[model samples]
Target: SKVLIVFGSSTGNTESIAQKLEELIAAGGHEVTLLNAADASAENLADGYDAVLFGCSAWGMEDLEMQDDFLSLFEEFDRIGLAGRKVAAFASGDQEYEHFCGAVPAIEERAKELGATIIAEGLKMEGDASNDPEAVASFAEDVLKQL
Candidate 1:
C-alpha cells in the first residue's frame, strides 16, 4: 500500500521530520509520497493511498502555520470524507510557547471531521530535530503499525 505524507512548514522544522518519516517508511518497504501541504490541492489527494500523514508546525497560540490555506484544502477532505483511510499527524514547535506544539491538535480536528481514523496520538517535538530521537522513532513505529 502507498503512503502519502503531506506537510506544512514555516521554518523547515516540520519538513525535516516529515522527510525522516518518509525515509523510514520507505525503508519499511512501502511506497511513499511526501508532499508540501502548500503545494497540494484537494484534487491532488484523491483516494487510493493506504495511509495519509500530516506534518505541520505551530504558529501563533494553538494555530496552524499558514492556517488559511491548510484549512481551505482540508475542508475539501471533510466534504469528501476519508473514511476507511488510515491517518496520522505530527508537529514541531518551541516549548517556549505556552501551548508547546499546538498544530497537531488543530490538524487532528480536521482529520476527525473527515472521518480519518487516528493511527496514534500525533507526535509533537520541540525546536530542532535534536530533542528526542527515541520519541520520534516510537512515533514512526506507531505509524508503521497503522500502515
Candidate 2:
C-alpha cells in the first residue's frame, strides 16, 4: 500500500513518531512517504496513496491547539480530496496540559466530516514515540489490518 505520513512537531516529538511509523510500514513492504506539514499543502493530498496519516503536537495552555503548520493545512482541508480517502491522526501532548493530544481529536473530526475513512484510533503519547514501542506497534497493527 502507498501511504502518506504528514507531521508537525515543535520539538521533534511528532516528527520522530512519524519517522518510526514510516520505517515500520516500509519494512512491512509498504511504500511510505513522510511529510513535514511545514512543506505540505492540502492540494498535495490528491496524490495517489492508499492512506494518509497526520500527526501533530499540541500548543497553548488553556485550550488544546494544533501545532503551527498542520493547523495551516487543516484550515484548507476541504481541498484535500478527502471524500474517499483513508486517514488517521496522531499527536504528542503534555499530560500536564488541560487537553492532552488535542490535535488528534481536532484532526480526526475534520477528516471524518470530510468523508475520510478513519483506519484506527489516533496515536497519542506524552513524548517521543520510541519510548512507547507498544503503542506504536498497536497503532501500526490496526492500520495494517485496515490496509
Candidate 3:
C-alpha cells in the first residue's frame, strides 16, 4: 500500500510525529511518502496513494487555526481528489488554548467532505510526539491496519 503524510509545523512537533509515522508505516511493509506542507501541493496530491495523513499545528493564543503553510495548502484541498481514499489526521497542540489540537478536526472535516474515508480518530498530543511513544505508535498501527 502507498501512504502519504503531509505536515505543517512551526515548532517541529507535528513534523516529528509525521516522520515517526512514516518510519513506523514503512516498517509495516508499506510505501510511505512524507511531505512538508511548504512543498506539498493540493493538485492531485493523493491521486496515487491508498491512504493520506495530515498533520498540522494550531498555532495561536486562542481559537483554532492551522499552521501557515498548511492553511495555504488547505485552501486548495478540493483539488487533491481525496474521494474513496483512506485518510486520517494528527496534530500537536497546546492545552492552554480554547480548542486543543484543533487542526486535527479541521483536517478531518475537510477530508470527509472531500469523500475520503476516515480510518481512525484524530491523534492529538501536547509537546513533541516523541515524548509519547505509545500513543504515536498506536496511532500508526491503527492506520496501518486499515491499509
TM-score pick, better of 1 and 3: 3
Runs in model 3 deviating more than 4 A are 61-64
Write one digit per residue (lDDT tens) for candidate 3, span 57-109: 88875323779889889888899989999999999887887888888888899
Off by over 4 Å in 1: 44-46, 61-69, 79-81
Model 2 lDDT, full chain set: 0.86
lDDT to native, each model: 0.75, 0.86, 0.90
**TM-scores for every predicted model:** 0.85, 0.94, 0.95
Superposition error at 43 for model 1 (Å): 2.8
Better of 1 and 3 by lDDT: 3
* Ranking, lDDT, top scorer first: 3, 2, 1
Number of clashes recorded per candidate: 0, 0, 0
Best by TM-score: 3
lDDT of candidate 2 over 1-147, digit per residue (tens): 998998999899889889989888888889999999999978857469889999988897532377889888889888888878899888888888777888898888998998899999998887887778788878888888777
Residue pairs clashing, model 3:
none
Model 2 residue 31 distance off true place after TM-score fit, in angstroms: 0.3
